[PDB]
Amino acid sequence: VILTQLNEDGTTSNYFDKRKLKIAPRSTLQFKVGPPFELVRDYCPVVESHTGRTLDLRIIPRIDRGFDHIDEEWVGYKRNYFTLVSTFETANCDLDTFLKSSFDLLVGRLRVQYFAIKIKAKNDDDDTEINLVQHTAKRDKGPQFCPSVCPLVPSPLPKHQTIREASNVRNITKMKKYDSTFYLHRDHVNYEEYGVDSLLFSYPEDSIQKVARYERVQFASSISVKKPSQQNKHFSLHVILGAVVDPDGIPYDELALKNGSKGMFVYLQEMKTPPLIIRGRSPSNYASSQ
DNA sequence: GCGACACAATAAC
DNA sequence: AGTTATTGTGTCGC
Numbered sequence: 113v114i115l116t117q118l119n120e121d122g123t124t125s126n127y128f129d130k131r132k133l134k135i136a137p138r139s140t141l142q143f144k145v146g147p148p149f150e151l152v153r154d155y156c157p158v159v160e161s162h163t164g165r166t167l168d169l170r171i172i173p174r175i176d177r178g179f180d181h182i183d184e185e186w187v188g189y190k191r192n193y194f195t196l197v198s199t200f201e202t203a204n205c206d207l208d209t210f211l212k213s214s215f216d217l218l219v220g221r222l223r224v225q226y227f228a229i230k231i232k233a234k235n236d237d238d239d240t241e242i243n244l245v246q247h248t249a250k251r252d253k254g255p256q257f258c259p260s261v262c263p264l265v266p267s268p269l270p271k272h273q274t275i276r277e278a279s280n281v282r283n284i285t286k287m288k289k290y291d292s293t294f295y296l297h298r299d300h301v302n303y304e305e306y307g308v309d310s311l312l313f314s315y316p317e318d319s320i321q322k323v324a325r326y327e328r329v330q331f332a333s334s335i336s337v338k339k340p341s342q343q344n345k346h347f348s349l350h351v352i353l354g355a356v357v358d359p360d361g362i363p364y365d366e367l368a369l370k371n372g373s374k375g376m377f378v379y380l381q382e383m384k385t386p387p388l389i390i391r392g393r394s395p396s397n398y399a400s401s402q
Numbered sequence: 403g404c405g406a407c408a409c410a411a412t413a414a415c
Numbered sequence: 416a417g418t419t420a421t422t423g424t425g426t427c428g429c
Contacts, residue, residue, distance in 0.1 A: 130423085137422040138412040192423060249421060252406075280421065283415065328422090333404065393403065393424095400425070 115181070119145050121271035127180040130189060130391075134399045143276050146175025146194070147186040149351065152382040156362055158224065158355060160205075161214040167205060171229075171383045172269040173198035173351045176276070178329075179388065187389045189397070190337060193247075196326045197275055198229050198351050199267045200381075207266055211312040212305070217355055217378055219362060224355040225314040228377065229324040230261045230365070233331060236348040236387045243332035249280065251328075259326050261354075261367060261377060263315055265296055267322035279327065296320045316370040337392040346387035353381045 115127045125144035128135065135141045149171070158167040178194025180187050188194060202210055215224040233242040248254035270278075270293055278290050299318040306313055331347070339345055354377040356367060362378065369375030391397040 134424080136411040137424080138414095138420090139423095140412090142423080189423085251422070280414065282420085286414095395425095398424070 114141070117145075117181075119272045121273050123271075123273050123276070125181075125272075127182060129180065129182050129187075130399060131397055132399055132402075140276070143177050143272070143279075144180065145272055146177075146179035146196075147181075147385040147388065149173045149383040149385055152350070152384050154381050155379040156355070157218040158215050158380060159218055161216060165204070167215060168203040169353060169381055170201050170203065171198055171351050171353050171381055172201055173383055174269060174272070174275075175349070175385070176272055177327075185389050186386065187391060188331075189391050190331055190333070190335065191393060193328045193330060195275065195279070196231055196329060196349060196351070197269065198231075198324045199269045199322065200227065200229070200264065200353050201268070202266045205266075210266060212307070212310050214309050214311055215355075217357065222355075222357045222376075222378070224311065224357060225375075226263050226311070226316065226356050227265070227380075228261045228263045228354050228356055230352050230354065230377065231259050231324075231326055231329075232350045232352065234348050234350060234384075236346040236384075242335055242347060245330050245332050246326065247328045247330075249328070259329065261356075262321055262324040263317070263356075264321050264324055265312075265315075270323060275325070294321060294323050294325070296322055331390055335390070337390045344389045347390055348384045348386070348388060350382060350384045352379055354379055 113128060113133055117125045119125055126141045174197050176195040176197060178188050178192060216222060233244050235242060244259050245256050246259055247256055281287055297319055298312055337345055357376050357378055359374050359376045364376050364378040367375040367377045395401045
């Protein structure tokens, strides 16, 4: 009924089929590590301004809620939240040096303003994009939005337990204790240590995330989860690391920039999950039906 | 099959 | 040692 796997940090992931077993909404059993991600490809090279050294980049993503491993499939529920977190790392550059440096795209050099992550959902069989929606904790009593592009600086990915612990914090004292895990406050650095051209100072806002945390995410309510044959559709979640540049023939999305003008999110690397099954609202997907 | 509202279990405090 | 928050899901009604 419950299959248990040990996570990297010693917590457990407890996989169960909601067709057979109903567990409380806030049970720790709802938190579990989802499918592993795989490299799709690398795109535009990034080099340091003077040294010319190529920046080695790696997305570090994890799903922490919403997916179960059931008979060799990864299964989510349309009605329910998932959590997808990601950082990135730069194997050949420590953070403190990285923030003081400047970087160009090798396309022919475009200056990188900042690094960012976005997520997408796709039909894994035909590459069609599928809309994602997010809620606040207030859900229907608050706004709905689509996942946004998240400026980030490189950081290790927090342990599964840390994401759990930080999922619904309001208390100021606890917020302070997790602050350094999730944010860099540029307004707190010594500005005298940085050149005008430094990467840190081309980030759009003073509060800079170290971790992209997409919580309370769902596939759009209008998604069809079955093919016409009644076979399950296969979906995939994608994480894309990009460099944002000033647009003043390679893969990129347009981006509503800080100063209002046109911006360019130039793809650097992309990872995705293996195929995912999503169970719809049908009564037969729930243990209540039995 | 979807938007909306309802209920209720365990976290958060 | 209480109250309020969050979220899986039951149900309504079109």
